[PDB]
Amino acid sequence: DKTVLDANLDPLKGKTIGVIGYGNQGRVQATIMRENGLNVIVGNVKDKYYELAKKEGFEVYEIDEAVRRSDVALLLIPDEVMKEVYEKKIAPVLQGKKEFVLDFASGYNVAFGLIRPPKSVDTIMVAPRMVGEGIMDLHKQGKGYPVLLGVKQDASGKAWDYAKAIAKGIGAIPGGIAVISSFEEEALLDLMSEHTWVPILFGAIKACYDIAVKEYGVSPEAALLEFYASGELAEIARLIAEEGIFNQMVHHSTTSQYGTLTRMFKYYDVVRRIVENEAKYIWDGSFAKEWSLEQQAGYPVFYRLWELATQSEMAKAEKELYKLLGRK
Amino acid sequence: DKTVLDANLDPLKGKTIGVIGYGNQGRVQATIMRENGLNVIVGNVKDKYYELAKKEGFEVYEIDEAVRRSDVALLLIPDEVMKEVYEKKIAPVLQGKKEFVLDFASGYNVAFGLIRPPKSVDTIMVAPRMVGEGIMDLHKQGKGYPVLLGVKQDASGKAWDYAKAIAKGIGAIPGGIAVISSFEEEALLDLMSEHTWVPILFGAIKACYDIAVKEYGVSPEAALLEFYASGELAEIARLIAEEGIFNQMVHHSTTSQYGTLTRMFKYYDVVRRIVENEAKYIWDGSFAKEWSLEQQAGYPVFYRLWELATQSEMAKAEKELYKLLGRK
Amino acid sequence: DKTVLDANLDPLKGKTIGVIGYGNQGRVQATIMRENGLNVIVGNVKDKYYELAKKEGFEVYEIDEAVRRSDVALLLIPDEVMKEVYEKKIAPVLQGKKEFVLDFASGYNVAFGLIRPPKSVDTIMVAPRMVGEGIMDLHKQGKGYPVLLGVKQDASGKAWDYAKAIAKGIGAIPGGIAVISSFEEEALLDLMSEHTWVPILFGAIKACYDIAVKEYGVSPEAALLEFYASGELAEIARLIAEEGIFNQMVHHSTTSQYGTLTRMFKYYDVVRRIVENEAKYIWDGSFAKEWSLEQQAGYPVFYRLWELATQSEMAKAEKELYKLLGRK
Amino acid sequence: DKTVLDANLDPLKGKTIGVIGYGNQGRVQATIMRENGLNVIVGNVKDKYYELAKKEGFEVYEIDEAVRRSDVALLLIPDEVMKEVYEKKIAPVLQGKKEFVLDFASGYNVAFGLIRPPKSVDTIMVAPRMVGEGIMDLHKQGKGYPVLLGVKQDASGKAWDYAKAIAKGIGAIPGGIAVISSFEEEALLDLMSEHTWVPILFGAIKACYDIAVKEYGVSPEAALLEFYASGELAEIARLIAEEGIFNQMVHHSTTSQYGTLTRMFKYYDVVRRIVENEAKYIWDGSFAKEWSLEQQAGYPVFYRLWELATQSEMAKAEKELYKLLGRK
Numbered sequence A, B, C, D: 001d002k003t004v005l006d007a008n009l010d011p012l013k014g015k016t017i018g019v020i021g022y023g024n025q026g027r028v029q030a031t032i033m034r035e036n037g038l039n040v041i042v043g044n045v046k047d048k049y050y051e052l053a054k055k056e057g058f059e060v061y062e063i064d065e066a067v068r069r070s071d072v073a074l075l076l077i078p079d080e081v082m083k084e085v086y087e088k089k090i091a092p093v094l095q096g097k098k099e100f101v102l103d104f105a106s107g108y109n110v111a112f113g114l115i116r117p118p119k120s121v122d123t124i125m126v127a128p129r130m131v132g133e134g135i136m137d138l139h140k141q142g143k144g145y146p147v148l149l150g151v152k153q154d155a156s157g158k159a160w161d162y163a164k165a166i167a168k169g170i171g172a173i174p175g176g177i178a179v180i181s182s183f184e185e186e187a188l189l190d191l192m193s194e195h196t197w198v199p200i201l202f203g204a205i206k207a208c209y210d211i212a213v214k215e216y217g218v219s220p221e222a223a224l225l226e227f228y229a230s231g232e233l234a235e236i237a238r239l240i241a242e243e244g245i246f247n248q249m250v251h252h253s254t255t256s257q258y259g260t261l262t263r264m265f266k267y268y269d270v271v272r273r274i275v276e277n278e279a280k281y282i283w284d285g286s287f288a289k290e291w292s293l294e295q296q297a298g299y300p301v302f303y304r305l306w307e308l309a310t311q312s313e314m315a316k317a318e319k320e321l322y323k324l325l326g327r328k
């Protein structure tokens, strides 16, 4: 199969590396690769993070100074401000380079054309699939972890080797794995999840609550206990990842199995058409445009929805309960 | 009827003219009217074009400078950057004028309100209907060529006279003609063509290819030969422009005539509905809004579509083929 | 893999050939193989053409006489009269043959069963993709040109060799190419083009005109200048055939590209449905029946439509105009 | 204006006329114009009509012979056999003529392209609006009567004069009138009547009968008395033709007027849609195709319908009844 389990690490010995940002991700990658025998420098503005990184032993600079010194760079910062930074400070120095390597953690700002670097550069991609904290909690066992690879522009044929060397330098492999894919094939995923089943689930829960209350005379303090106020859900999401998704149900009763399976094979089509519509809306690039426009307006909708959701009925009752049970 | 065939040229003798931009159009217009007995000056930024115009015997200044010296101006540049230019350099120098004449080549940035000059100015329109190159290939025979005229604001009653004088000064008349119309009546046209039959044609071709392949087991190397890989279309367009649209078919076989006529009179309503929808969407001004917003966003959709189209199935086969026939 | 570029030519040395018809095709196809070192004889009715072919150095006989002498034949005449000819003069003289070869230029009269020759005959197909005139303009460069091959009935296992030898004998190869296919896979093509995008295009243009006029108060003398009275379509088709279909647009503006691409990916479904319907209506053979019937009636619909189309407002306006521009 | 009431008659004095057919129409026009000072000859096959026509004082020849002698001709025969006749006997004798005039009584076989004479000929139309018998019953009062005129092909600028002279030579004017129109504007009419209200009326009557019987227990021997077995209808049509269509109702009772007017303004749209569909089906020429094909088959549908209609229930009841009232 395409999968990869280990590779070399030499192309990054003899060069310097410039890490951008020192948030959750930037901190981890940086340290782990300082351990693997690499020269590392950071680029960031003088703020809280700035003091935190040097303090761990690093020689911290500002951003564009960390690039003139480097032949490689890691742009580990959010996808909402990464654009502006690339045009003001980076773009000129980048133009004034000969052979560079530029890395990302997400393909949003690239796959959709919001960033179009030159052809004198080797562009790559490296995307983990961990929340960011447990990654360290696992590396201390020598464990690896999974990632996604990809490339958009190679001018030396060495892009894949560079990417594998990177994935190795961060403890992801050996021990874990790394897949080959494109940028689109990662943004598509990181969005669909945030668009199809999370909101569907939330709305289904809210609807169960509303119906149980306003049509069957049920107490608000009860529904919550069953639906999500109890950690039964976590128990499900756990056995899912460990024992499997379907084999998980073997631990529950037969009635639950029957109802679940029937109603699952019964509603599979609606969710399918929904997912189709959303994925199509994304593939073309409308959602990026929508989000950028909303940014250009002042996040009005965001405000009103963040209001409505909290000022709903379920949220209030949840408040009294969580208080009554000590839950903060 | 409305049509005009020739008029005077005296109102432009005794004045100066400022031609903005020395691209395809501006170059031609200036080169021509330098011959009809007129003094001409250019305004443009110092780049490739700047060296070319002066090289041809012109005196080249900066844009704002070329206006202080002029009582007339030709704003021959794309409709995508004209706004900022007009707002920064022109607007003040124009406020500091007494009686001016401003000319365009399209009505997009005006008809839709993206430009609202003062009332101390005569605003006009002159729109050819040629690709830009053949205009020279024809003037060398002394021929004329067709144009569209219009006016948005006149404060001296001489606007139409100025417009006719201009159309004469560029060799369009006599020999060709000139029509009277508005700005809307030109943008509407220059858009509808780009919105109704070009894309319908392209999609129909693509669909014929896809169907022929994926449902009848046909070779990709064949369909192209019939549909567009052969220059049969060029002959059709030529006979259209020269002999007539319908009379053209007299040269083809009876079977083709029958099929074409029937299937045309059969599928006329659908395209009519489509065209109605699009023209209505334009008349109000939504398309301009959409385009300006996409500009403000970063042309994501443009990028993704330019990607999909090329990464299609037909394009790859056409690429394999063009290489095979020797076609570059 | 599939395509062919050159082959042998020996099977046609030691044999005679009988060319039927001396119209456009028969004229070119004959001279070239006469040059390539082949004995050639023509069969045609004694009329204008009859004098032309012999005048060029040929020995002209009558059709039935040209077959008794030949072991091979080329039936290069329209698909509307071929049936009677084959049924009256050819079939009788053909029963008393032993090893014959029969060639065509189209598969209409065969693929649809309107002709069912015997089994002692080798039936083949050769279909160029050129207007018929430029083919000779190109052969003088030693060039080749495209063709489609196919077979319906082989009683000697040598049919493909004969077809390749033929294609080589008319200058199409080497220099050009030749594809292997069936009769259907050519009739389907030569029809769909005449059924799907040509009439859709014509109707869309007509509708654009009608709408622009009768709902926005536009002048008839103007719309034409934009839509087709200018040869912009010719430039589009030329760039299509030469550089590519989509890459063609790079020479246009950005607004045009955006509108075109959007409206193309927006309507792809409707035309797909249309094309499906038409291709299905053909595959089964209904259109052939329709056309064979209309002939038995007197071409009434043909007449009425040829009338309506010409007596439309657009045609009258184009007539008033083409006069005004000197166009005959 | 737009109408004619009288005109000259000299262009037809000094010439001969060939009247084809001696049926109801031809007999009348011939007998008449033999009185207005014209030399007349007939062409027809030797049968009853031939003997009758030569008995009435004419000199009779054979059709083809009657044309060599004439410079004008009247083709007064049905529209179902005219084609073969024109193609066999007339066309050959007509190619060798110099300046001819050809007249019709209906535009069916022409307007639809089933006949396409040469260009050295003057083609015209003259269509009365009478059953054929009463025309003589009226002429003997010196009256005129209505006609329709038209032209398809004039090569001498004299057709209209010829047409008026003809309309005069038959006593239709003065006393009557003559209208200007085309061939289409005559066949369209002569068909619509036979397609829209005649069959609608018949079906409505049949339906009233069926409903009255099979849902309200009525006697078959009664309904007929009311619906059409009584001549009440004839009076309505007579008053229509004489006093007017709506003023007619003044003689009936109020209740009738109210119901009629209401249900008339209530059902106007449906019949309008029907008529639109039918007129459109005609204008293009599909009905002619249909009829010619049915002719080419054996008139099966005609037979089956002539059977069904007569073998209905209403017909059997009317047969039992008419016998009971002495009606043959």
Ligand SMILES: [Mg+2]
Residues within 6 Å of the ligand: A190
């Ligand atoms: Mg995310």
Ligand SMILES: [Mg+2]
Residues within 6 Å of the ligand: B190, C253, C256
């Ligand atoms: Mg344009």
Ligand SMILES: [Mg+2]
Residues within 6 Å of the ligand: B253, B256, C190
């Ligand atoms: Mg063809």
Ligand SMILES: [Mg+2]
Residues within 6 Å of the ligand: D190
């Ligand atoms: Mg009739």
